Amino acid sequence: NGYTYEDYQDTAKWLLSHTEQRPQVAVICGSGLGGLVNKLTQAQTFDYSEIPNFPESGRLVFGILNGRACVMMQGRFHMYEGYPFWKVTFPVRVFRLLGVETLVVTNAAGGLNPNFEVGDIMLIRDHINLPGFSGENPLRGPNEERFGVRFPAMSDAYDRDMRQKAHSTWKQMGEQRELQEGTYVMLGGPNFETVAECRLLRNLGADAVGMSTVPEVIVARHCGLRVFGFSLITNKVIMDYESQGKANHEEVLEAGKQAAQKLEQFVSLLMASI
Amino acid sequence: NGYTYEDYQDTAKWLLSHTEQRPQVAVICGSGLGGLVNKLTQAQTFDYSEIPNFPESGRLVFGILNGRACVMMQGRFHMYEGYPFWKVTFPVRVFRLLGVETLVVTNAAGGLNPNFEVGDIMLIRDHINLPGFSGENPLRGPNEERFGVRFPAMSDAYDRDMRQKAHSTWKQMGEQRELQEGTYVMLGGPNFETVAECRLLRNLGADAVGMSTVPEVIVARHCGLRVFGFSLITNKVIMDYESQGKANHEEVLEAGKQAAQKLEQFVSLLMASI
Amino acid sequence: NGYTYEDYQDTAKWLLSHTEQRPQVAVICGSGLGGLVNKLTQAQTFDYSEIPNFPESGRLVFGILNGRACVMMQGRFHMYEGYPFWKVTFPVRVFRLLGVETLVVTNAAGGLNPNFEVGDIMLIRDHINLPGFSGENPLRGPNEERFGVRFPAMSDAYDRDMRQKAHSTWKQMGEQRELQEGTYVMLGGPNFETVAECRLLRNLGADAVGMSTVPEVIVARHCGLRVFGFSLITNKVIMDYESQGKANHEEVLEAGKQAAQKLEQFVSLLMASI
Numbered sequence: 018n019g020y021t022y023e024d025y026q027d028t029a030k031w032l033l034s035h036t037e038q039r040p041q042v043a044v045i046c047g048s049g050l051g052g053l054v055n056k057l058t059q060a061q062t063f064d065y066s067e068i069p070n071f072p073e074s075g076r077l078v079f080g081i082l083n084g085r086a087c088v089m090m091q092g093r094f095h096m097y098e099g100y101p102f103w104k105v106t107f108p109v110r111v112f113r114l115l116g117v118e119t120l121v122v123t124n125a126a127g128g129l130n131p132n133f134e135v136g137d138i139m140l141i142r143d144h145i146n147l148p149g150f151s152g153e154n155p156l157r158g159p160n161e162e163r164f165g166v167r168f169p170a171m172s173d174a175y176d177r178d179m180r181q182k183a184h185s186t187w188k189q190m191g192e193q194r195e196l197q198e199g200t201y202v203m204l205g206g207p208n209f210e211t212v213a214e215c216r217l218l219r220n221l222g223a224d225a226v227g228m229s230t231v232p233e234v235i236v237a238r239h240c241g242l243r244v245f246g247f248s249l250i251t252n253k254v255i256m257d258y259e260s261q262g263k264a265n266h267e268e269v270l271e272a273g274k275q276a277a278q279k280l281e282q283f284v285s286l287l288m289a290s291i
Numbered sequence: 292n293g294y295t296y297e298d299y300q301d302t303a304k305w306l307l308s309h310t311e312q313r314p315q316v317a318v319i320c321g322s323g324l325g326g327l328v329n330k331l332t333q334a335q336t337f338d339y340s341e342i343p344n345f346p347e348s349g350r351l352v353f354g355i356l357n358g359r360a361c362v363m364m365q366g367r368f369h370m371y372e373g374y375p376f377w378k379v380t381f382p383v384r385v386f387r388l389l390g391v392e393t394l395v396v397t398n399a400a401g402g403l404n405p406n407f408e409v410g411d412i413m414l415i416r417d418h419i420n421l422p423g424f425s426g427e428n429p430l431r432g433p434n435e436e437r438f439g440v441r442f443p444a445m446s447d448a449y450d451r452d453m454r455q456k457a458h459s460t461w462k463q464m465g466e467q468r469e470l471q472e473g474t475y476v477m478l479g480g481p482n483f484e485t486v487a488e489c490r491l492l493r494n495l496g497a498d499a500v501g502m503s504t505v506p507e508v509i510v511a512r513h514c515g516l517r518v519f520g521f522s523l524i525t526n527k528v529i530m531d532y533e534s535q536g537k538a539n540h541e542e543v544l545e546a547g548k549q550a551a552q553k554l555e556q557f558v559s560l561l562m563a564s565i
Numbered sequence: 566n567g568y569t570y571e572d573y574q575d576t577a578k579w580l581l582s583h584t585e586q587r588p589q590v591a592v593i594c595g596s597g598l599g600g601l602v603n604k605l606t607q608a609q610t611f612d613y614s615e616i617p618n619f620p621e622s623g624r625l626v627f628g629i630l631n632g633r634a635c636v637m638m639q640g641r642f643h644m645y646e647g648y649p650f651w652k653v654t655f656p657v658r659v660f661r662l663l664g665v666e667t668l669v670v671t672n673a674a675g676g677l678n679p680n681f682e683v684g685d686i687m688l689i690r691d692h693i694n695l696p697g698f699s700g701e702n703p704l705r706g707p708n709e710e711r712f713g714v715r716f717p718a719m720s721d722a723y724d725r726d727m728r729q730k731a732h733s734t735w736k737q738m739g740e741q742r743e744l745q746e747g748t749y750v751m752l753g754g755p756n757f758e759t760v761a762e763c764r765l766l767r768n769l770g771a772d773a774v775g776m777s778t779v780p781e782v783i784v785a786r787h788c789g790l791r792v793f794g795f796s797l798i799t800n801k802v803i804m805d806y807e808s809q810g811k812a813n814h815e816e817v818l819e820a821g822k823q824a825a826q827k828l829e830q831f832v833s834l835l836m837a838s839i
């Protein structure tokens with residue numbers, strides 16, 4: 018870890034003296050949810066560039082959403098951009114020092130489960146941390162007891178009650194497609210997977226594949242935060258050689274734009290379940 | 292990535308001013324194919340040590356092979372020697388700047404498919420990038436748009452037409468053994484795999500296991516190169532505990548020497564299919 | 566690798582001039598076996614802090630155990646603490662330079678095999694090196710021929726004869742539970758695995774999961790050492806979502822304390838089988 022405990026405190030101190038807002042919930046906006054910061058009331062924005070110690074991008078926005086005090090990251094950091102996990106997850110620890118109690122994390126992912134369709138929303142019930150198997154972990158290094166324990170458990174990382182309420186909220190929205198729920202696997206990227214790799218990941222028990230989130234969840238659980246997350250299925254991964262399809266970021270972005278309104282409403286409504 | 296865009300250009304410039312040769316095809320010679328540089332006509336060799344910015348080894352040879360202008364790497368770089376992938380793949384980007392359009396990559400690999408025999412040639416139809424799952428990727432870092440896109444697809448990395456023609460060429464050579472075709476999995480090395488690991492890799496869907504190639508293919512596809520590759524099966528990996536066999540580099544080298552003449556003829560002939 | 570050949574020699578020289586002991590066996594004490602150093606006779610201890618070049622912790626103890634000259638590490642190094650594998654395995658090469666011929670390595674591990682119970686001892690018959698698949702390997706870098714070969718085989722890493730004798734010794738101890746034997750998989754840590762990851766590891770063929778040992782075994786085999794190892798099953802990993810259990814280090818430590826007397830007797834007795 019490159020940051021000292023003091024660096025985290027210094028950043029939290031700067032934020033507390035520049036806004037009267039005191040968030041209880043933090044939201045890391047993944048693909049398709051970037052526009053959520055526009056729904057906040059009594060909002061205050063800080064470009065990441067103005068906040069001491071923050072990694073380069075991106076804006077941090079404080080405000081009220083459906084009755085809850087929130088702090089949102091419009092744009093996140095990725096291992097594929099060259100960032101070490103201690104940088105990617107820096108904001109999570111700052112949020113804890115600010116008084117946050119719940120972390121909502123979202124992303125865009127390729128569908129491995131054959132029953133998923135583009136546009137589906139998949140609640141993350143569990144994850145598979147591939148980089149972690151090789152030691153690439155935000156917790157690598159001496160443990161800071163002021164945040165958490167040396168060996169934190171992860172089998173109960175995704176809050177059960179929040180997932181239960183998510184389905185209830187979904188029914189109230191009267192959506193046609195059912196709300197999916199499964200396992201998210203994280204890999205480094207930035208290239209899209211080969212057919213052999215996709216077949217491999219599905220056989221490992223994964224339902225969706227992406228390049229983020231897991232590191233943030235690990236750090237959040239370590240410092241005691243409640244966690245809720247979901248993936249927007251932006252594409253169905255290619256599983257055979259006779260297929261003419263091919264993953265492409267252009268289409269992925271469009272899927273995100275198409276689901277934007279739905280994702281924003283979903284999140285706003287679930288604020289009351291926290 | 293440690294190299295700047297300018298470093299690549301500088302190296303390409305040095306090469307262009309030191310030889311009149313203008314290659315259209317690049318060949319990275321793996322185990323057993325080191326002698327191919329001796330078949331080139333109007334050849335010109337440069338030890339890697341004389342080329343500015345080149346990683347340490349190894350010779351770069353320009354020349355004509357069966358009617359095609361080529362540039363060949365006699366000796367490649369490996370992650371197990373301590374090289375980061377941005378170093379291992381440096382030559383691939385230089386080749387693109389030189390005007391190359393097709394990359395032929397070869398290697399020696401252990402056979403996982405039970406039907407393979409020592410001496411067999413396996414066309415690479417797909418790959419599994421294990422280091423990539425953990426973020427070890429030549430593309431890690433800010434993307435250079437002058438080479439390619441941020442999220443390149445890899446499901447169609449190994450050119451279908453070239454593989455089709457490879458089988459046709461094989462029949463004309465009248466070989467006894469059939470030309471194999473499957474999935475190559477790359478791992479770091481340098482130790483040979485345990486029985487448990489071999490069983491694991493086979494269950495992942497891999498047909499052959501090696502310690503190179505994949506990084507070069509990823510960088511090649513990113514910058515638009517057409518790719519063709521194959522593995523020389525130098526040994527059948529140990530799959531059980533009651534077996535007395537044991538992988539050893541001495542035997543692997545001998546298998547390469549035994550297939551040398553065959554590999555050289557095969558490559559020379561397939562030059563006309565490009 | 567950060568250490569020079571001379572660094573290893575310098576450390577071995579310091580140790581040889583500070584004790585008359587000349588060990589033939591080295592024991593790296595994992596969880597639950599820390600108290601074994603108290604059974605040595607004619608013992609001499611060196612805190613790791615007093616030995617030039619040694620990584621930070623931990624004590625190195627020389628002495629006689631059941632008739633054999635030994636050198637034991639009371640405390641080991643882990644990748645999750647931030648140590649590169651060339652640091653974690655430094656002592657193994659020093660032991661070889663001292664004249665050691667056999668390495669005994671032990672650890673605490675989570676049980677993946679459904680038949681294992683807390684307190685069980687599992688002889689390590691094989692391993693799966695996940696960090697190694699991505700290149701994280703103590704042998705990464707130029708090879709030092711004075712220690713071993715560039716491509717060492719690992720399929721016969723765990724000595725068959727010693728495992729055979731281990732079962733004989735077990736019967737003489739008249740234990741109620743049978744001595745288990747299987748595959749150990751190493752991952753980075755420090756967090757405990759999710760349910761999805763545990764299901765994944767079991768399907769890979771692993772019987773126990775831990776965060777050490779493998780790197781030490783790889784380096785030992787490379788320099789010619791005979792190797793014997795075993796895991797103390799400190800907990801049964803959570804394999805389903807309806808389970809209320811959850812891995813926790815407190816319970817893991819207690820399991821180690823409960824098996825301490827048994828582990829110490831087991832090791833002392835097997836000294837005669839070396």
Ligand SMILES: O=c1[nH]cnc2c([C@@H]3O[C@H](CO)[C@H]4O[C@@H](CP(=O)(O)O)O[C@H]43)c[nH]c12
Nearest residue numbers: 047048124125126127226227228229266269
């Ligand atoms: O098929 C996929 N494989 C791996 N990743 C992805 C993604 C995610 O969107 C981007 C590429 O279009 C990648 O960048 C991240 C985006 P996010 O911050 O996780 O929402 O994860 C990947 C979508 N589909 C796939």
Ligand SMILES: O=c1[nH]cnc2c([C@@H]3O[C@H](CO)[C@H]4O[C@@H](CP(=O)(O)O)O[C@H]43)c[nH]c12
Nearest residue numbers: 321322398399400401500501502503540543
């Ligand atoms: O059984 C194998 N497992 C992993 N790698 C290999 C290899 C390859 O040859 C060398 C060891 O003899 C290694 O070095 C590279 C050679 P290449 O540049 O990929 O042709 O990949 C490995 C052969 N058999 C096996």
Ligand SMILES: O=c1[nH]cnc2c([C@@H]3O[C@H](CO)[C@H]4O[C@@H](CP(=O)(O)O)O[C@H]43)c[nH]c12
Nearest residue numbers: 595596672673674675774775776777814817
């Ligand atoms: O369930 C487990 N998963 C991964 N590791 C472990 C362990 C090992 O004990 C510690 C955590 O309690 C970790 O630290 C090491 C200890 P050792 O030096 O290998 O004996 O490996 C892990 C026990 N149970 C599990």
Ligand SMILES: [Mg+2]
Nearest residue numbers: 066068070071
């Ligand atoms: Mg700044």
Ligand SMILES: [Mg+2]
Nearest residue numbers: 340342344345
């Ligand atoms: Mg030079």
Ligand SMILES: [Mg+2]
Nearest residue numbers: 614616618619
């Ligand atoms: Mg010291």
Ligand SMILES: [Zn+2]
Nearest residue numbers: 031034035036
């Ligand atoms: Zn100010």
Ligand SMILES: [Zn+2]
Nearest residue numbers: 305308309310
């Ligand atoms: Zn000149």
Ligand SMILES: [Zn+2]
Nearest residue numbers: 579582583584
């Ligand atoms: Zn002294």
